[PDB]
Amino acid sequence: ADPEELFTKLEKIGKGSFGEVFKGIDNRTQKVVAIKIIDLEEAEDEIEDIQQEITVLSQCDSPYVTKYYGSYLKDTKLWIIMEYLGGGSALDLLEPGPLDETQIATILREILKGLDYLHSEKKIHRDIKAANVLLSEHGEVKLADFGVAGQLTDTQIKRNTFVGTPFWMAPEVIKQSAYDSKADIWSLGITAIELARGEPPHSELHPMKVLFLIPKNNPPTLEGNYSKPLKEFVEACLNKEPSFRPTAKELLKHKFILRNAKKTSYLTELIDRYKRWKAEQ
Ligand SMILES: Nc1ncnc2c1ncn2[C@@H]1O[C@H](COP(=O)(O)OP(=O)(O)NP(=O)(O)O)[C@@H](O)[C@H]1O
């Protein structure tokens, strides 16, 4: 199985902490794919995380989670084949300017369907933030970046690992207590603020400072010119006690969602705005 023979790299579309991501195509069947290529010698440090990402990805089967088309090994390089999402991340789409509440609600609804799927599979994402929410060019919204996702089982009904991105981390995760899927609900509340304001609470502070602030301080609220149901949606998520947070399933029925969420195809307006912006940068 030679991925240099099976796939054609068309353009580089991303560079993360390790490896490189390419826009590619299956030379058989001509489906366009995202290809994450990692040098396993250069990232021997991360092989455990890479293994987990691939494992979780292979076990997911949902229109709200980035599809996985397998991994290929060429010499020391691992080729991870995924669904290609060329619309940009929700964070990318914030670059040109603010979202309206119709866009915020539509994006949050789709993130919620993704979380409801994961949580029904007893999986916890643990790194929900707008950068890890990816859109297709025609506005479909999917969860990405499963490198630190956790699996609950019948025996392991809670997780304890300190993991995530600090601005978005739930207080119970930070204070490595036993936690479950409600940790993602906190992160969603922070992401809702991020979608509304362009950045999470404490964004200007040092990450290590935030790590003691999040357990100590009052939970964040959304202030300013936002509808009260949006402010209430945020408040519902950002409860320091995880058992008082609603499930993703309940949140799908929240008034801010029901009132403001529209068809995902309307998000092409946002995707075009990003393309216009990018062309004049
Ligand atoms: N399936 C995909 N389709 C399109 N773009 C993607 C896809 N997966 C990842 N990307 C983008 O490619 C880049 C590299 O992604 P990745 O290697 O997963 O690092 P990252 O987690 O986004 N950043 P980091 O947390 O600093 O390592 C990012 O800008 C992603 O948004």
Ligand SMILES: [Mg+2]
């Ligand atoms: Mg990441």
